[PDB]
Amino acid sequence: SPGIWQLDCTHLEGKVILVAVHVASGYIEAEVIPAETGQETAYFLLKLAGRWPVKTVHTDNGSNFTSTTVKAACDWAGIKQEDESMNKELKKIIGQVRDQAEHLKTAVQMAVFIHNHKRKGGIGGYSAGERIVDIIATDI
Amino acid sequence: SPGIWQLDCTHLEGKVILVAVHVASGYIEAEVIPAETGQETAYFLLKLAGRWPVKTVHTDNGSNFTSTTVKAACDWAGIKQEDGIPSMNKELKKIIGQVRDQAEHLKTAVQMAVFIHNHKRKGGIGGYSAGERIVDIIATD
């Protein structure tokens, strides 16, 4: 179902990685923020919804999700809030490349790239990035 | 032509907005950044290439694109950087004006403007938004 996302946090090197996964494709958007604040959550949600058709986000039940700024952002963007493997593996990929860049946020974006472009299976398979565009274009 | 994006910058309230426009559809991605440095630009392009299949980037050849760090990122990501190959900015700045008094900070209003731009139906009730066009242009199957 095309508008469904899951949003999770990962700590690492004492920073926070916000990860949104498109549930039906496995396609990932992620960013590193100083701290898991209401402000940063709202900002990330607004960004995600202006880039993809986001109907429903499933979250952990942290306090960042129920701030007034998050609620105003979700209200404005038409996002409905609700209450894992693609997250273990982003961490894995991050380990595979941690040592190609100085900074953690570069590594994180390299991992998102590698994840989203990686063909699954043999000749005839699709990457996550292909699945999401395909699912949305079919829906339209 | 589906893998081509045009990068431009626009300046507001003393801040820097970096804009990437998918030329065939008009879809945009945009971020407020501190200043147009080699690292911020390389970071922006790596985010973009991780999210859409970017073949080619046309730039304004600003000094941030001659940075060694940008070239290394484009090489890493497999992007052909085309410098100096010739206005979303005007449109975006006007959408920003319509939402500016809803956001405590410019950065928020920029993302609200990107949301409205990508969702806006173009060319009548039988139209399509930039968002629909891009997925339609990019989808392979």
Ligand SMILES: Cc1onc(-c2ccccc2)c1C(=O)O
């Ligand atoms: C309807 C519909 O279906 N998909 C999109 C869309 C929106 C933003 C990005 C990509 C697709 C969209 C829209 O509201 O423009």
